[PDB]
Design a protein around this ligand. Structure first.
Ligand SMILES: CCCC[C@H](Sc1nc2ccccc2c(=O)n1-c1cccc(Cl)c1)C(=O)N1CCC[C@]2(CCCNC2)C1
Length: 253
């Protein structure tokens, strides 16, 4: 037995390999010099579309998180700039993304930073939601708490987060999944940020779909995107309804 730190995956994250079994695991080194909540949240998780948590180890000042190694890399690296990826592949990743998000929201957890860098792939190209450093509990004892903290990455963040003092957690993760779908299908992010001062975002609200990235997207998935990227979070489509959408259920090969 004994693990070797073979290389840098991305503190930092190193790839550890068992000297006997040759089994691998990602080790996240968190120089505490987030983390507490991240370990806590990780302990509650167990789902095939969420990066597995093996355990942790303080060992002084460097906190060590032991996480599932995803040999396929980041979804981010499967997206060709300006092109996207084949629709069938994007749909399968999107189905898997919704499976992971339904699970998280089911146990009252919001990820808050969904984007392709945080969606990793295993050996069989199964999507795994990664990094719970920004995650939080939005439901406890069956009572929902509204969020107010600015968390996320601008291009993927929901507009309410920039405009409202308080907002529901779930539609924010739905929105970020819609920007991920756009990136998969167009190899392009639609706007720097979702604010009226951003020309691209204003054009979308005025339905100028003849512009990029929308023009590269087929009408069926674009119809789903019209339901997800709705400014008013109360009017935005919910996950159960996304799962009933026409494109979501279209057979593709
Ligand atoms: C068409 C080729 C350009 C594609 C780039 S892709 C991109 N832009 C980013 C811009 C800001 C932050 C992160 C990214 C990023 O991760 N990607 C990125 C790169 C590769 C893969 C992935 Cl998933 C993301 C893009 O969408 N924009 C940069 C150029 C101008 C924008 C303005 C908004 C309207 N679309 C074009 C945004």
């Amino acid at each position: 037995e004994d693990w070797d730190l073979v290389q840098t995956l991305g503190g930092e994250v190193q790839l550890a390999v068992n000297r006997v079994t040759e089994e691998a695991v990602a080790v996240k080194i968190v120089d505490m010099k987030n983390i507490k909540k991240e370990i806590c949240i990780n302990k509650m998780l167990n789902h095939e579309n969420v990066v597995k948590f093996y355990g942790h180890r303080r060992e002084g000042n460097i906190q060590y998180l032991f996480l599932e190694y995803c040999s396929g890399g980041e979804l981010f690296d499967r997206i060709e700039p300006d092109i996207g990826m084949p629709e069938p592949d994007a749909q399968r990743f999107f189905h898997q993304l919704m499976a992971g998000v339904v699970y998280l929201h089911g146990i009252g957890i919001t990820h808050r930073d969904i984007k392709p860098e945080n969606l990793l792939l295993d050996e069989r190209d199964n999507l795994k939601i990664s990094d719970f450093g920004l995650a939080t509990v939005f439901r406890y004892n069956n009572r929902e708490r509204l969020l107010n903290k600015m968390c996320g990455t601008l291009p993927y963040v929901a507009p309410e987060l920039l405009k409202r003092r308080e907002f529901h957690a779930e539609p924010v993760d739905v929105w970020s999944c819609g920007i991920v779908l756009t990136a998969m299908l167009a190899g392009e992010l639609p706007w720097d940020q979702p604010s009226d001062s951003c020309q691209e975002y204003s054009d979308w609200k005025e339905k100028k779909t003849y512009l990029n990235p929308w023009k590269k997207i087929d009408s069926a998935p674009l119809a789903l995107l019209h339901k997800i990227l709705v400014e008013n979070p109360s009017a935005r489509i919910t996950i159960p309804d996304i799962k009933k959408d026409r494109w979501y259920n279209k057979p593709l090969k």
